[PDB]
Amino acid sequence: FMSVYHIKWIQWKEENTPIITQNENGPAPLLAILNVLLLAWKVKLPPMMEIITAEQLMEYLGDYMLDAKPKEISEIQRLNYEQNMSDAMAILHKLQTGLDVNVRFTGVRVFEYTPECIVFDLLDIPLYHGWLVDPQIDDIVKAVGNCSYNQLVEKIISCKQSDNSELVSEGFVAEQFLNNTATQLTYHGLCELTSTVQEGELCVFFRNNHFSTMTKYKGQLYLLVTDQGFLTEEKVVWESLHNVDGDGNFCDSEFHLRPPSD
Amino acid sequence: MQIFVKTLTGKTITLEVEPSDTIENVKAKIQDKEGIPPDQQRLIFAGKQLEDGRTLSDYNIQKESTLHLVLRLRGG
Amino acid sequence: MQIFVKTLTGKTITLEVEPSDTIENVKAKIQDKEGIPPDQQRLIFAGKQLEDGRTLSDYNIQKESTLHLVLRLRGG
Amino acid sequence: MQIFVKTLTGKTITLEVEPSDTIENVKAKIQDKEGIPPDQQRLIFAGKQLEDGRTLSDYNIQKESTLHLVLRLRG
Amino acid sequence: MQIFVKTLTGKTITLEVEPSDTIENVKAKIQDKEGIPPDQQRLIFAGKQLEDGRTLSDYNIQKESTLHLVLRLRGG
Amino acid sequence: MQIFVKTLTGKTITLEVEPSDTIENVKAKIQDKEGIPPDQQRLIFAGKQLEDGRTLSDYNIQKESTLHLVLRL
Ligand SMILES: [Cl-]
Ligand SMILES: [Cl-]
Ligand code: NA
């Protein structure tokens, strides 16, 4: 049947803004996009809403996307927009089940330009990942090159069944680079990420098959906590992203550390 | 009854539809009013994609409701 | 028939299929024995990404041949 | 491999787990080591809930990683 | 005994029910008062979904409790 | 063989490709002629999206087939 979500109200920039919590796995990409819109005050809900349904969440996102009304455009922009919107809506329903992204390991914003990557452009919501190859190490950067995941994963298959020694070596090196970094975040990726995200930016961060809302406060990256388990814990709003192992620091709505509950 | 269909370009159309009308019938009524073929049409209501084989009662589309039209390349 | 489905992690699955089945059928068989979505699946034989519309006979699928299962990066 | 399970009260559980262990097994492993019923238990890694039914290898849980714990509220 | 039910519009409807009544019968009472069909309702209390086959006493429903009501208008 | 790429405006370009060329490679050819970056191009064939990693033969791209170019700012 229908999925229902719980609204957790927090104090973002002195004003009472709502964020929508997550229970079962799936709703992550829609929840990341809308939480970006709720925090930036682009979309807002009546003041005391506690739970919200799936149809309402899609109605809000659909109305905000289709009623943009930008008139200063030529025939190139207009017809490209109507097509970029058409393919965006054929996928838009997937934002509830689960969104697929193709990842390339050379930059924090470098993705394959798919109709799923369009929604983050029509809303001007930057989309980031941290699965970057370490450029100072040569034997991995040669084997992975400028390949994407759907390309590298086919590359190691064709490499495994080759007869060349240098080819199976590159295939095994690329396989090991995927097996060692299965958390979809690398040390160099976190370093370049912190540099690329602007201070006060509101974006969506892909990692470990999850879409989470991200910001940068005083040079430090943070992910908003979206789990329903923390819905009633008023002092956990942001988790600091400072390591690859998930040893984040829980902070409150003003990015101050949370005291243990004793 | 009456429902509205809004283009991304601001132009808003009005169709005399029935609550038992199929989305294929609505797409045909948009063709009878503007000439856009039903294959180039994508109909949206409240974030949902209006599918071909359903009707307006399944989506709870009542009087003076507004749907969104997005043009599409020949889908094949 | 009996074919092998090999993940990248080395996990190999056995599946009783027939050369008369479609690739979409095999993806449903893997959904039942693994819980993997049929949308996320990408099968690979001889460098080709096997298409849902075709059948195993069109790909020269033979007995105890192995199909490499790889999965798209899905975020949910 | 060993993994850590920090929580809100400040405690930090350590468990000797394998990638194939199901989510109910790590929940039962917590019931053994620190005495909390998996009935009222709920885990979080990377801001995503680890559902009852999947495995740590299905979530790409690496060695020496840090999980998170909370009380399962829904009945 | 009396129980309160809050709708999305903010209006609270009060009904007269017994603790041994099932959720389907309570949905029929909502159909008699507000006219909504039981095929379009979803009842929520304490962060959980009330099953149609469960009684009020099975969900530990106390007196003067306020349960939320959500609907399935746009199906799919 | 030659394929043709038509933008939504109506401008059709001519390219010399081989069926064993990946779409990422074809995108680089369009960058050579029109100057558009590959990560800003969207190639459509028969109203369906074409992945960067596949080859033309994988999509049954025959001779004189024409593809729709869609842009991204
Ligand atoms: Cl603030
Ligand atoms: Cl982007
Ligand atoms: Na900020």
Chain A residue whose CA is closest to F48:
A87
Task: Tell me if residue E70 falls in helix, strand or coil.
Answer: strand
Retrieve residue C21's tokens: 């089945």
Rounded Cα gap, residues B36 and B22, in angstroms: 17
Of A217, A239, A216, whose CA–CA distance to A226 is shortest?
A239
CA C19 to each of CA B44, C2, C28, C41, F32: distance values in angstroms, whole numbers, following the listed order: 41, 10, 15, 19, 44
* D36 within 8 A of D5, measured Cβ to Cβ: no
Beta bridge partners of A70: none
Rg of the Cα atoms in chain D: 11
Which ligand has the minimum distance to the alpha carbon of residue A255? 1
Task: Tell me if residue F45 falls in helix, strand or coil.
Answer: strand
- In this complex, which of A4, A55, A228 lies closest to E44 when CB atoms are compared? A4
Does the distance separating the beta carbons of B58 and E73 come in below 8 Å? no
Q: Is residue A261 part of a domain?
A: no
Number of C-beta neighbours around residue A193 at 10 A: 23
Angle at B22 between CA A63 and CA E8, to 5 degrees: 40
Rounded Cα gap, residues B30 and B33, in angstroms: 5
Rounded Cα gap, residues C46 and C59, in angstroms: 9
Integer distance in angstroms from the first to the last C-alpha of chain B?
33
Rounded Cα gap, residues F19 and F56, in angstroms: 5
* A239 within 8 A of A251, measured Cβ to Cβ: yes
| Distance of residue D62 Cα from the nearest chain E Cα, in angstroms | 32
Rounded Cα gap, residues C21 and C67, in angstroms: 14
CA A98 to each of CA A24, A233, C55, D18, F10: distance values in angstroms, whole numbers, following the listed order: 12, 27, 28, 27, 35
Of B45, B31, B58, whose CA–CA distance to B3 is shortest?
B45
Beta bridge partners of F6: F12, F68
Q: Which domain holds residue A165?
A: 138-180
* A213 within 8 A of A197, measured Cβ to Cβ: no
Residue A53, Cα to own-chain centre: how many angstroms? 22
Retrieve residue B69's tokens: 């039209």
Beta bridge partners of A185: A130
Q: Which residues contact B26 (CB under 8 A, 6 or more apart)?
A: B15, B17, B43, B50, B56, B67
Angle at F25 between CA F19 and CA F31, to 5 degrees: 125
**The A220-224 sheet, strands edge to edge:** A127-128, A203-207, A210-217, A220-224, A238-240, A250-251
Torsional sign, CA A65, F48, A108, A94:
positive
Rounded Cα gap, residues D22 and D55, in angstroms: 4
Chains F and B share 3 or more Cβ pairs within 8 Å: yes
Give residue D28's identity as a one-letter amino acid code.
A
Rounded Cα gap, residues D3 and A247, in angstroms: 11
A59 with A83, same domain: the answer is yes
Strand-pair category, D2-6 with D66-71: parallel
Number of domains in chain A: 2
Of B74, B70, B57, whose CA–CA distance to B17 is shortest?
B57
Beta bridge partners of A206: A211
CA E20 to each of CA D57, E25, E26: distance values in angstroms, whole numbers, following the listed order: 45, 10, 11
Strand-pair category, B2-7 with B12-16: antiparallel
Q: Is residue A237 part of a domain?
A: yes
Overall resolution, Å? 2.8
Residue E43, Cα to own-chain centre: how many angstroms? 5
* C64 within 8 A of C6, measured Cβ to Cβ: no
Chain E residue numbers touching D73 (CB-CB < 8 A): 47
A42 with A153, same domain: the answer is no
Retrieve residue A127's tokens: 């989309």
**The F2-7 sheet, strands edge to edge:** F12-16, F2-7, F66-70, F42-45, F48-49
Retrieve residue E54's tokens: 């469960």
Write down how long chain B is: 76
Rounded Cα gap, residues C3 and C14, in angstroms: 6
Q: Which residues contact C14 (CB under 8 A, 6 or more apart)?
A: C2, C3, C4, C5
Chains A and F share 3 or more Cβ pairs within 8 Å: yes
Each residue of A227-242: b (16+ CB within 10 Å) or e?
bbbbbebebbbbbbbe
Angle at A241 between CA A240 and CA A243, to 5 degrees: 125
Rounded Cα gap, residues E40 and C73, in angstroms: 35
Which chains are adjacent to chain C, needing at least 3 Cβ pairs under 8 Å?
A, F
Q: Number of residue pairs across A and C with CB atoms under 8 Å?
A: 55
* A227 within 8 A of A31, measured Cβ to Cβ: no
Rg of the Cα atoms in chain C: 11
A62 with A92, same domain: the answer is yes
Chain A residue numbers touching C8 (CB-CB < 8 A): 153, 156, 175, 178
A126 with A51, same domain: the answer is yes
CA F42 to each of CA A114, A115, B11, C37, F68: distance values in angstroms, whole numbers, following the listed order: 8, 9, 27, 26, 8
Rounded Cα gap, residues A203 and A211, in angstroms: 10
Integer distance in angstroms from the first to the last C-alpha of chain C?
35
**Residues 10-29 (F) with a CB less than 8 A from some CB of A:** none
Q: Is residue A84 part of a domain?
A: yes
Rounded Cα gap, residues F48 and B75, in angstroms: 7
Helix (H) or strand (E) holding F42: strand F42-45
Rounded Cα gap, residues A213 and A202, in angstroms: 7
Give residue A60's identity as a one-letter amino acid code.
Y
Rounded Cα gap, residues A254 and A185, in angstroms: 26
Q: Is residue A101 part of a domain?
A: yes
A52 with A37, same domain: the answer is yes
Does the distance separating the beta carbons of A84 and F53 come in below 8 Å? no
Dihedral angle, C-alpha C73, C75, D3, D4, nearest 10 °: 160
A26 with A78, same domain: the answer is yes
Retrieve residue A152's tokens: 């590298």
Which ligand has the minimum distance to the alpha carbon of residue A217? 3
Chain F residue numbers touching C49 (CB-CB < 8 A): 54, 58
Distance A254 CA to ligand 2 centre (A): 27
Residue C11, Cα to own-chain centre: how many angstroms? 13
Retrieve residue F71's tokens: 């842009």
A102 with A75, same domain: the answer is yes
* C19 within 8 A of C55, measured Cβ to Cβ: yes
* A108 within 8 A of A132, measured Cβ to Cβ: yes
Residue F4, Cα to own-chain centre: how many angstroms? 8
The DSSP code sequence of D5-67 is: EE-TTS-EEEEE--TT-BHHHHHHHHHHHT---GGGEEEEETTEE--BTBBTTTTTPPTT-EE
Q: Domains along chain E? A: 2-71 (3.10.20.90)
DSSP summary character for residue B62: -
Task: Tell me if residue F25 falls in helix, strand or coil.
Answer: helix
Retrieve residue B65's tokens: 């409701």
Retrieve residue A230's tokens: 């923390």
Question: SS3 for chain A, per residue?
Answer: CCCEEEEEEEEECCEEEEEECECCCCCHHHHHHHHHHHHCCCCCCCCCCCEEEHHHHHHHHHHHHHCCCCCCCCHHHHHHHHHHHHHHHHHHCHHHHCEECCEECCCCCCECCCCCCCHHHHCCCCEECECCCCCCCHHHHHHHCCCEHHHHHHHHHHHHCCCCHHHHHHHHHHHHHHHHCCCCECHHHHHHHHHHCCCCCCEEEEECCEEEEEEEECCEEEEECCEHHHCCCCCCCEEECCCCCCCCCEECCCCCECCCCC
Residue ranges with strand state E in chain C: 2-6, 12-16, 41-45, 48-49, 66-71, 74-75
Helix (H) or strand (E) holding F68: strand F66-70
Q: Determination method here? A: X-ray
Residue given tokens 């040390």 in the structure block? A187
Helix (H) or strand (E) holding D3: strand D2-6
